[PDB]
Design a protein around this nucleic acid. Structure first.
Lengths: 95, 88, 114, 56
RNA sequence: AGUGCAGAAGAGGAAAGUGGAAUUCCAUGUGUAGCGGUGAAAUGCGCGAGAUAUGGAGGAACACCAGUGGCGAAGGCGACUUUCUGGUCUGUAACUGACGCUGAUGUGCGAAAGCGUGGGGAUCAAACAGGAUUAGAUACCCUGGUAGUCCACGCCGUAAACGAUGAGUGCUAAGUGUUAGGGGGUGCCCCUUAGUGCUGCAGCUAACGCAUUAAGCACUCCGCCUGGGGAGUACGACCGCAAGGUUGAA
């Protein structure tokens, strides 16, 4: 009863294949210990409020995956702050 | 919290077929076993001060229930201060 | 002084920094309340800032700026006398941004005279 | 009135939104307190990503 | 009645800081006459600080859903990616057939500071360096300035705990603002099995206030109080890392 709708923002100045690398990992990081991977949409390649290292935006998607163990999206969240290429990690609980 | 699966699976067990749930056994049974689990967030992250109220509130419930059942039978308080894990 | 100007003007309640610049920081010209003699509560006042921009526009003599697309930051009452009077050669206050000092209650405040 | 809106959406929170990237007060609005609370909450799950500015 | 409970709320609590008020620092995309200073100025950064922000991660707070809303016994209280967690119980109560009330034994524990790690500066605030004053200033004033300002570990307790309200039994108009959540229900009328804040019938207290949701009238305990000081000063008994307490004739 705890959806880890693990959406995220990818890098901006890159190609589609980099989007695909990131999005297949962030669909996949969860499969181990409970996948239920539903779809994969590719949302706005848009900007945001202020600058993020001379730039201000990135790439988006839509990732429907749930994990009741609560440890598959921690992976998605702990391995993000460190590398400036994964610039934000905001998931939900569709409880 | 103890996910409601935990509540309902443990609660059906700690009272014999005296024809329902909710004895002076299983009520406090769930209450105190939940204490024991929540004591970790009172120990592991041992900065927890406010479920130190949901805890001691039902401790006082458990205590006013516990301090008088010597007269229900010999075996309730005898075997059940054994059949509960809690002091005295 | 490149054939255009951009107004990064400022006015703390004291030292109304009238500053018509270019887009980068290439130092076109500046002004003041401390540029035309006023001190005695005529510093940021409408009757003491009548000609506050011509210590800039005609101490330019080669540009005669032509626009703002202004960022009226550092607001006061000296703002108005630093915009409407920024039209004394054709300096053409044209656009605004509604971005003045608006910090977000993270700072710590200096003191209060009773 | 509406059904749910969550951090899938960030501009279905533009009906009640300002020009700086924030939202208007609920007192000036006045609809389903519960529904409007979660609806506005998701936009703040989005000020995480901050798709809507703080100042320009 | 308590555990069953839909679970469900609200800043009840534990959630790293990915990002952002990113700060007085400065070659700086940019440069010098100003970031800036005021009852009265020096204070004060310029013999190569500047103006706001191009790299701007960081010391950190959710800044915006933030309301007087409401978890909880008072001190409180704000996105969450959420790491966890009880009760509270809103409807009747399935089980047992009194399932006991104030509670000096114990335990105790409770505001910044005072307190415990070294971090200790984002550097403001004490001292004040310093100007200045009507006849009258080390000053509420003024840039800057050494505890502290950025804390995951020993224990606490004085405050207008000004909440100066101590807790069992109902209560003589109920509406009313309404609360997540609801007894009959189905953006339409609601009643407490309920909750709050009340304009306030009604009746008492003492001049006042409470009021279907009561200081009034009836069964309650630790109790204090019974004209003022001085008086906590001889002196004092026992807790105790510390502010210290906590006692006690005249």
């Amino acid at each position: 009863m705890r959806t880890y709708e693990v959406m995220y923002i990818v890098r901006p100045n890159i190609e589609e294949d980099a989007k695909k690398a990131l999005v297949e990992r962030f669909n996949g990081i969860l499969a181990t210990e409970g996948a239920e991977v539903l779809e994969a949409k590719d949302w706005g390649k848009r900007r945001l409020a202020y600058e993020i290292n001379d730039f201000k935006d990135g790439f988006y998607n839509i990732v429907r995956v749930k994990s009741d163990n609560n440890k598959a999206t921690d992976e998605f969240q702990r391995l993000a702050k460190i590398s400036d290429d994964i610039i934000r990690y905001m998931v939900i609980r569709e409880d | 919290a103890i996910s409601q699966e935990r509540k309902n699976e443990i609660i059906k067990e700690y009272r014999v077929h005296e024809t329902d749930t909710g004895s002076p056994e299983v009520q406090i049974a769930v209450l105190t076993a939940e204490i024991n689990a929540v004591n970790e967030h009172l120990r592991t992250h041992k900065k927890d001060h406010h479920s130190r109220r949901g805890l001691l509130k039902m401790v006082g419930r458990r205590r006013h229930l516990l301090n008088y059942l010597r007269s229900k039978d010999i075996q309730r308080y005898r075997e059940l201060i054994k059949s509960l894990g809690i002091r005295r | 002084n490149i054939e255009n100007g951009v107004a990064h003007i400022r006015s703390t309640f004291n030292n109304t920094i009238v500053t018509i610049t270019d887009e980068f920081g290439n130092a076109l010209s500046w002004s003041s309340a401390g540029a035309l003699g006023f001190k005695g509560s005529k510093k940021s006042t409408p009757f003491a800032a009548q000609m506050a921009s011509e210590t800039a526009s005609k101490s330019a003599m080669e540009h005669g700026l032509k626009t703002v697309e202004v960022t009226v930051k550092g607001p006061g009452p000296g703002r108005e006398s630093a915009i409407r009077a920024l039209q004394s050669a054709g300096l053409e206050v044209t656009a605004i941004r509604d971005v003045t000092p608006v910090p977000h209650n993270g700072c710590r405040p200096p003191k209060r005279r009773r | 009135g509406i059904t749910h809106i969550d951090y899938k959406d960030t501009e279905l929170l533009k009906r009640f939104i300002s020009e700086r990237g924030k939202i208007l007060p609920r007192r000036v609005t006045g609809t389903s307190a519960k529904y409007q609370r979660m609806l506005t909450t998701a936009i703040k799950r989005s000020r995480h990503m901050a798709l809507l500015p703080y100042v320009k």
